[PDB]
C-alpha cells in the first residue's frame, strides 16, 4: 500500500462575444474543460465540470469541480488568472487580440468550497494581483479606474472524504461591462476565445 | 539530493524614451529564484550575464548548479517581457512590454559548462503572435512582433564533479519596433521581466 498522488493541470477556456471595446461583452457557456490528469503512474487528458457560480448583468463567476476519492488528503492549488483573448475567425491560429481585465474589489478572489461528500479544513488562501499603470493603453483604452491585469492565488487545505466526493474552485469574476473590455474593436459581434487562467491542483493522500 | 528545483522570473533594468527610440539594457545580474530541496522551500540567487550582444539585440544566459551525480533535467521557459516603472508611484504596475523577433535563430537553449555532459537533449520552442491590429501604447504588431517565446526542454546531465549548465534565453530586442512601453520625454528606467523559468533536477 502507498499514499496516492493526484494532480490536475490545465487552462480552462471560455468563448465570448465582443463588438467594440466600447460595449459590454456576452459570455458563452461553461462546460467541460480539458485538463491533464495524473494519478501516480497514470496520466491522461480528462474533462472537468465547469459552470457559473453566480451571474449578473455586471459579471459572472466561474467554478471548477474536482473529484476527491475516498480518503484523507492535503490539497495544494496554484492559480494564475490572466484572461487574454484571440479572435475565433482570425485566419491564423491563436493570435492574441487583447484581454478582459478584473475588478479591483476586495470580494474578487480565487476561493474553494465543499461539494457533495467532503469536509474542508485548514483553508489557507493567499491572493495577489498585477495592476496596470494608469496611463497604460491597450487598444485605445487606459487603466485609470484601476482595472487589474492578473489575479493569482495559492491555496492549501485538508479535505476528508468519507465517500467519493467533490470540491469546487471559484475563479475571480469575469467582468462583462466595457470598463474591462480591452479586446480589438470589431464591426459586429465577433466570437473570441478567452483563457480563464492556469490552474494546478495537487492532492496528496494521508494514511 | 534526489529532487532539486529552481523557479523564478529573472529581472533586467532597461531605459526607454519615446516610441521611435531604441531601449538601453542595464546589467546582468544576480537573479533571485525560489530554491527547492525535496521538502525544503528556500530562496537563492543564480548567476545571469550576456551570452552575446549587438547594436540590435542581446541574448541572456543563466547558470544553474548541478551537484555531483546523474540527473534528469526538465525546464519550462515561459518567455514574456512585461515592463514596469522603476520609481514610485507605480512600481510593479505594468506599463508595457518588449516584444520578440520572429527570426528562426532566436530561441531558448542550454549548453554544458565545467566538465558536465548533457545528453538526450530535446528542445521544443514555441511562440505566440499578436493580432496585427492589436495595439499597445499606440503601437501595433504589423511586423510579426511576437508577444511570447516558450520552450520545453528535457535532457540528462552526467556530473562527475559539482558543475553547472547554462540556459540561454531568446534575444532581447533593442530597436524601437519591439518597444511597447509608455513613451516619455526623458529616458525613463523600467524593470523588464525576462520570463518564468522552471528548472527541475531528478537524480538517477
Amino acid at each position: 500500500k502507498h499514499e496516492r498522488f493526484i494532480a490536475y493541470v490545465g487552462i480552462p477556456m471560455l468563448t465570448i462575444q465582443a463588438r467594440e471595446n466600447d460595449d459590454q461583452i456576452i459570455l458563452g457557456s461553461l462546460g467541460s474543460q480539458r485538463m491533464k490528469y495524473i494519478e501516480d503512474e497514470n496520466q491522461n487528458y480528462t474533462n472537468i465540470s465547469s459552470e457559473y457560480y453566480s451571474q449578473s448583468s455586471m459579471q459572472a463567476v466561474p467554478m471548477y469541480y474536482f473529484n476527491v476519492p475516498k480518503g484523507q488528503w492535503s490539497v495544494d492549488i496554484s492559480c494564475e488568472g490572466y484572461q487574454p483573448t484571440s479572435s475565433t475567425s482570425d485566419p491564423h491560429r491563436g493570435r492574441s487580440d487583447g484581454m478582459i481585465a478584473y475588478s479591483n474589489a476586495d470580494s474578487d478572489y480565487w476561493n474553494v468550497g465543499e461539494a457533495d461528500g467532503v469536509k474542508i479544513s485548514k483553508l489557507r488562501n493567499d491572493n495577489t494581483y498585477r495592476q496596470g499603470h494608469p496611463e497604460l493603453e491597450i487598444n485605445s483604452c487606459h487603466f485609470r479606474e484601476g482595472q487589474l491585469l492578473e489575479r493569482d492565488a495559492t491555496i492549501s487545505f485538508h479535505v476528508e472524504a468519507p465517500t467519493d466526493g467533490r470540491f469546487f474552485l471559484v475563479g475571480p469574476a469575469i467582468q462583462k461591462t466595457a470598463k474591462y473590455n480591452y479586446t480589438i474593436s470589431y464591426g459586429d459581434w465577433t466570437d473570441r476565445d478567452m483563457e480563464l487562467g492556469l490552474i494546478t491542483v495537487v492532492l496528496d493522500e494521508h494514511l | 539530493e534526489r529532487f532539486i528545483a529552481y523557479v523564478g522570473i529573472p529581472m533586467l533594468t532597461i531605459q526607454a524614451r519615446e516610441n521611435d527610440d531604441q531601449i538601453i539594457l542595464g546589467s546582468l545580474g544576480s537573479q533571485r529564484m525560489k530554491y527547492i530541496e525535496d521538502e525544503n522551500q528556500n530562496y537563492t540567487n543564480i548567476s545571469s550575464e550576456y551570452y552575446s550582444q549587438s547594436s540590435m539585440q542581446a541574448v541572456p544566459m543563466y547558470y544553474f548548479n548541478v551537484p555531483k551525480g546523474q540527473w534528469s533535467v526538465d525546464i519550462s521557459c515561459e518567455g514574456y517581457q512585461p515592463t514596469s516603472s522603476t520609481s514610485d508611484p507605480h512600481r510593479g504596475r505594468s506599463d508595457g512590454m518588449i516584444a520578440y523577433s520572429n527570426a528562426d535563430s532566436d530561441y531558448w537553449n542550454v549548453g554544458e559548462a565545467d566538465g558536465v555532459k548533457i545528453s538526450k537533449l530535446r528542445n521544443d520552442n514555441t511562440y505566440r503572435q499578436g493580432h496585427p491590429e492589436l495595439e499597445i501604447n499606440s503601437c501595433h504588431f504589423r511586423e510579426g512582433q511576437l508577444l511570447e517565446r516558450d520552450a520545453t526542454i528535457s535532457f540528462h546531465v552526467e556530473a562527475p564533479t559539482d558543475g553547472r549548465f547554462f540556459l540561454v534565453g531568446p534575444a532581447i530586442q533593442k530597436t524601437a519596433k519591439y518597444n511597447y512601453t509608455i513613451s516619455y520625454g526623458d529616458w525613463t528606467d523600467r524593470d523588464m521581466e525576462l520570463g518564468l523559468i522552471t528548472v527541475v533536477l531528478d537524480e538517477h
Binding site: 494532480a7 493541470v9 490545465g10 487552462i11 477556456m13 491533464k36 495524473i38 495544494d76 496554484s78 484571440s86 491564423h92 491560429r93 491563436g94 493570435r95 492574441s96 476565445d193 483563457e195 492556469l198 494546478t200 495537487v202 | 529532487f3 528545483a5 523557479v7 525560489k34 527547492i36 526538465d74 519550462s76 515561459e78 528562426d104 530561441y107 521544443d124 520552442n125 514555441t126 511562440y127 505566440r128 503572435q129 511570447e148 516558450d150 520545453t152 522552471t198 527541475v200
Partner: peptide, 17 residues
C-alpha cells in the same frame, strides 16, 4: 514550483525551426 510539469501555453503555434 510544483512536481507537476507546466503545460504548453494556449494558442502557441509550434516552432518547427
Amino acid at each position: 514550483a510544483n512536481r507537476v510539469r507546466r503545460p504548453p501555453r494556449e494558442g502557441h503555434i509550434y516552432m518547427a525551426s
